[PDB]
Write a protein that binds this ligand. Structure first.
Ligand SMILES: Nc1ncnc2c1ncn2[C@@H]1O[C@H](COP(=O)(O)OP(=O)(O)O)[C@@H](O)[C@H]1O
Ligand SMILES: Nc1ncnc2c1ncn2[C@@H]1O[C@H](COP(=O)(O)OP(=O)(O)O)[C@@H](O)[C@H]1O
Ligand SMILES: Nc1ncnc2c1ncn2[C@@H]1O[C@H](COP(=O)(O)OP(=O)(O)O)[C@@H](O)[C@H]1O
Ligand SMILES: Nc1ncnc2c1ncn2[C@@H]1O[C@H](COP(=O)(O)OP(=O)(O)O)[C@@H](O)[C@H]1O
Ligand SMILES: Nc1ncnc2c1ncn2[C@@H]1O[C@H](COP(=O)(O)OP(=O)(O)O)[C@@H](O)[C@H]1O
Ligand SMILES: Nc1ncnc2c1ncn2[C@@H]1O[C@H](COP(=O)(O)OP(=O)(O)O)[C@@H](O)[C@H]1O
Ligand SMILES: Nc1ncnc2c1ncn2[C@@H]1O[C@H](COP(=O)(O)OP(=O)(O)O)[C@@H](O)[C@H]1O
Ligand SMILES: Nc1ncnc2c1ncn2[C@@H]1O[C@H](COP(=O)(O)OP(=O)(O)O)[C@@H](O)[C@H]1O
Lengths: 217, 217, 217, 217, 217, 217, 217, 217
């Protein structure tokens, strides 16, 4: 199929490897810590102990063959950078690297990392958003101004109909889904009822959704 | 306004604190490492050096007053657990804790954490999804089976109309938005055109979306 | 049989282990400090060097088999707590833990310690009672108001009879025992004599006993 | 009234100071740790930050005036010893010192401590006694053979009368008190009932009390 | 004249700054360690305490104005790299950086350092050359095979003439200079004499010079 | 051949060892840091982990046999000094030591170091000279005033003859060599041509060479 | 012969052990630092690694057998004291202990040390005496008034005879020895000569010797 | 009078300063530890806090004026060495330095210390001498082989005459003095009696004196 190499079996890298393996892709789990290799042996096609900063070991892995290599080392800046550089000189098509801080991001950028990810920082922003607003369970930003939001229904919304809560005209937003006791309603008709503590999926402008949260719920 | 306490200024905690501070909330950044306290001094209301496992220090912080306390320590399990337990005993309303593994999740659960977050595991699943399918930019899971997906349009989709790509009947999914050159089209009509390299927002069953990805694009 | 495990060979734990061993019970003395293990090797059935916060070591001890486990670590709160949690998850019937302060007591309480002991605090109250009243050698409180007290006889009590010192009617208290030159008299008859420097065991109300001490001796 | 000096506000010293202050005695709480002084300022007449090993500070406290000085430092042997020596040379009438081990006890003995206390060791013996016999809540030893014991009543004792349980004749021991739901009965008459889970106060020979526990409850 | 910025007043950087200042150039000596700034205050035009990794401080220095900026930080890789990057984004014409190891050299190379110097490594090669051959005081390599060498004259060369030591025909090398007691003779005539302990400057092939060293001196 | 001992595998020492090994000399690489020993194992005859300040280890190395011992420790003054002294008492013929500062130089001098080297300071002077004058590729100073300089030819020198550029009479300097495309011309005749970007080797007075650089190129 | 135990191989203890071993006595060198044990292995009968504060180790050494035990630990007061006490309870005949300060001296005294030595303080007094008076090289006091003094001969004494310097009649003192260029003359005859810079050994009254120093030399 | 500088108020240095001050000499007590300066303030002319390794502080002390400077730092080799070097370059007439080990002695020697003292080692030799022989009270070594010894007389010597104990012919040694009940006899005649427990002063060869101790007493 496609070939993925995950170097550094941290929580993030480990998750990548485990999930990718669940999808049934060829995943090479590389790790200098023996116990990590032993841990993810069940969760990979091939799990190898290797020092990814050592070039001959990287050649012994045959890493050139892989379409995607992911450097999930985000504590040891030197190791991460060095590995990324090695892979770049080894002409890897796609090099995705976990970064720790803005400047490690910078050096990764300059040595030509293809995609740089800050999992903790991002997820942190998300959890902070959920923290300031207990009503937002999840969301996705379509753009700087437009977004789809998942909301936890309050008492103000109990036994209310979609036609009763006219979001399409009053707030310019559109409701997409209602999740009640695990049961799910996609693109629901105006007659449908929303009961409290249910999942509500609205779509529109950020400020408009905020407005609806304010006066509506 | 609201009062937030962020204990452990890692990348995740640090991000929470920084972002929350950008929102203009009262954020107490707590950290046993002095340099971390000095680092996020600009991005908090009050930045304090404290051993969160040492309780008298926790009383010296006056943490009982806070509505939300975030334990963003995810490497030192013992520290995290001890701190969370301490906060629970101090009758803190909302305790959100970062977990490292399933078992740390378990002990947090049993000592009554209010919300447990796995930033790296989740983000890992997301990036893995993006890895197996270069065409998925982002997504949100409504449930175990149902999801809203953001797609990168290929050449197979160029100059194709929404009525041409009948997703609502052929695949049971519904298109929600089209992003073309930064311009944005919300809940578009069947006459609208999709050009390649544009953002496409589909909604439906996971397997169905996969189907459409397979035969459609 | 019943097997007792004493983790932490301090003065308190060490005393427990030594005394229990003198009683002829099967006692496992656990200690991360080698010299402590070597110290109490003579006073236990099995003395083992182990890190009780490390789960695999706790399994290597086979601690699950034990009816009673005593955590006598009272300086290192973190260690104590982690250990107690470990034992609880390992379904130990009776977990008795030494505590340092009110809140360490609390955290032990929430993670389900079966009995929490404050040796220094208690003993402190007792010695303080002995300090404010030079006459009291020892005592036991039956309740908030009622108590049995051991008293050191002064010259005021020399050659005095029980009927002479009518405590049962004049002070509402009752004399229980007289210890003279090591010889012992239990529940003595009214004809019996009390000589100075002897042990006197009175029983009654605290304030009443104080009265008898005041006007009597 | 009387003047007490408590040096070292640990759990033991702290307890002494707090309790003595509750009795309304003049207690000087001395401590090199500022936070401890701040902690027990409410529970002493004068709470001072001082290094008790430094002689000029000890004169600055005016410790010569005190009838009783208590050295409650039991971890730092050198500090305890040095302090005790200082107090001895300053002709203090009564010097009571907390000890850690047998040899610290020895050096305290040799430099002329007036009373040496091992709170943890003693309390440890007591709790161990309570461990080998679940029925004993508390006790006091009148001598090597004779003792007064507090017992937790089992189902075997429920709804039983004092005359029914003839301890004075069958076992040579005498019942002193019965505590039922917090209510208290001192030196109860033979008609009185003992209900389960109540506190029972027996007095007699150790082996005899053991006998009564064996066949009786 | 020209404007030089020396960041990091180590031995190497300090030497650069001092020497440059002796030549009468405008040299800005920058250093986060105050005592270093105080040390080279006499040997610079402007000596400033600054964190060169902090951008606003770098603007406060007005570093954009300088033609040459020298990063003489070679122990703290992160600091060096970071500074170099900052300078690069600020469009500095010439950035010369001291490197520690091959990989620090690599990252400097990739973030676009203009000249990278390894003082210890080079000087090391030179001193090693002097070690294997006690006769060489100094030298310069014209190419892989051809070189000009400074030699310490031995007794075999004492009172010997240039025509006596026919290097131009016997060894294919040419003598360039003779230094006697500080006095100096450039391109000396064949009648000229060489005395021991004098500086002799020969020019030719490496192996040929070695030959002359072998049989000649 | 000859035997060299390199103690302290820094950049300087490491360079010495590597270069000497390239020359094919017997080099003992000594280092207290295991990873350094492992690093230069390929670049030495024998690479040993040793604390050079410990005498018995120094005898275990058999360092007395070596003609040359190099102390390349330049951060840890005490280590360097102690080691050098050790070697001196062991009657080592030649002890060359890396120095950090003027006073470390002094103590090395007083304990009888045979040659003391300051690589960073020297090389620093050189780089400073190259900094104030961008034109010089390399050089060697014969004395305070007289020098041989290697110059990079500009367009002003293209297609010019040696007789055309009369340096011997107009500037009192003499051209020694011309390097064109790797090809090399030693002591060239006046008919020879200099093409731009070639290496030019001039010899004479510093100020005179400066003059020639100014008006000539 | 006799058996000596030297605990603590410092400079003082080490000197004791080495010297005693040179005399050919059975010396047990005990030390918790392995390297010290390895150091004095050549200079003892048996050199053992042991923690002298640990009683079971002290029994493992078989220290009860020894006539003399020397505690040469003078930095670690607690170790010294604890050890000394240990030896005392083990009924050691002679316990000689090195002391640090007056109070450590006190506690050693009180726990029954047989001889307490202050090497640095004493030797300090001596060197101070030599400092205030350059003429005295060494001396021994026979009593408060009478003494034997070693003097450095000055120029006033050069080429002078014993009969010339009539000390027995003019100064009431008697010359005992003359040391010239290492050669030694015991109880020299009146014809004997004193040369400058030689060692002169006078005997008599202190004030008389001072007198001779004044008027004679 | 004369001016002494004592740098480093240890036990040895402190002793020097105190004793010298008792003699009434001008003593400058220098110490980087403030508490030491405060301790010996009563026992010096001027007691100053100074870092003796810092040259400007040494000039601030005005140390050039002093005839004698004593470096009594014997734990911190670097401090001692650096200071000694500083004093030497400042041309102090007499520099006496305390040494720790043979190599520190060496570096002191090489940087030109005037007198080097090993108090612990020496005093150690003395105490060892007293240990192997309980009879020797004091002594002075004239040379490696020759010595004057003070001896405690045993019962073997009681009521014995000098002519009876013919040491001058039988052992080649000479008796110099007899101290009886505080009374003193200098250079006693052969008729004089020696009684036990008296001080006996013999002079001669070491082995010979040992011989006399063996067969005589
Ligand atoms: N030089 C290297 N070569 C190969 N793997 C490395 C190297 N350095 C680090 N790693 C890998 O990184 C992993 C540790 O990552 P971790 O420290 O857990 O990240 P985080 O601290 O962000 O959780 C280890 O399993 C190790 O295999
Ligand atoms: N017991 C504790 N008390 C207070 N702060 C702590 C404690 N343990 C860890 N921390 C803080 O947590 C931070 C480390 O978080 P980090 O390990 O970076 O999270 P992650 O591994 O998810 O990136 C440190 O800055 C440290 O100060
Ligand atoms: N993580 C741990 N695992 C095992 N034992 C521990 C741990 N932490 C502490 N201990 C035990 O506690 C013992 C000492 O307790 P101590 O500090 O003396 O209590 P206190 O200070 O109250 O006297 C040590 O000997 C050690 O074995
Ligand atoms: N030199 C000293 N002078 C005054 N107080 C001291 C000194 N040394 C220790 N202490 C006191 O001892 C107390 C700590 O005792 P602690 O270590 O808790 O005993 P334990 O560990 O046996 O419970 C501190 O409050 C401190 O003030
Ligand atoms: N970010 C920075 N900004 C300014 N100066 C710095 C920075 N980082 C390091 N320095 C300076 O560099 C110097 C250290 O250089 P050094 O480590 O001695 O080089 P080397 O190890 O090559 O001798 C310090 O004096 C410090 O002031
Ligand atoms: N006691 C010692 N014995 C032997 N080698 C030592 C000792 N102390 C330091 N070294 C050597 O010094 C080297 C480190 O020098 P380094 O700190 O890199 O100097 P700098 O910091 O000036 O570059 C190490 O390779 C180590 O082997
Ligand atoms: N309890 C102990 N048992 C055995 N050896 C000890 C003990 N305590 C200290 N020592 C030894 O004493 C030596 C240290 O003496 P040191 O501190 O150098 O004396 P000083 O400070 O007077 O020079 C060490 O080698 C150590 O091994
Ligand atoms: N560089 C220095 N300048 C001034 N005083 C110093 C310096 N280094 C050490 N000292 C002083 O020397 C004293 C330590 O002597 P110490 O180590 O007790 O000698 P010893 O080890 O022989 O007992 C300390 O009081 C300290 O203040």
């Amino acid at each position: 199929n496609k070939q993925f190499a995950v170097i550094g079996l941290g929580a993030f890298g480990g998750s990548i490897c485990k999930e990718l393996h669940r999808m049934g892709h060829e995943v090479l789990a590389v790790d200098i810590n023996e116990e990590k290799v032993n841990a993810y042996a069940s969760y990979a096609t091939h799990a190898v102990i290797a020092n990814a900063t050592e070039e001959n070991e990287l050649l012994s892995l045959g890493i050139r063959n892989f379409e995607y290599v992911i450097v999930a080392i985000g504590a040891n800046i030197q190791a991460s950078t060095l590995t990324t550089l090695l892979l770049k000189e080894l002409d890897i098509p796609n090099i995705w690297v976990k970064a720790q801080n803005y400047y490690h991001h910078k050096v990764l950028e300059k040595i030509g990392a293809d995609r740089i990810i800050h999992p903790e920082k991002d997820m942190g922003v998300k959890i902070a958003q959920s923290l300031s607003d207990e009503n937002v369970l999840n969301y996705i930003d379509l753009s700087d101004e437009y977004s789809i939001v998942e909301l936890l229904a309050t008492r103000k919304l109990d036994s209310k109909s979609i036609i009763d809560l006219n979001v399409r005209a009053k707030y310019g937003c559109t409701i997409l889904a209602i999740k009640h006791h695990g049961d799910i309603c996609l693109s629901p008709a105006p007659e449908d009822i929303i009961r409290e503590q249910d999942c509500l999926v609205i779509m529109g402008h950020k400020k408009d959704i905020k407005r609806f949260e304010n006066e509506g719920m």
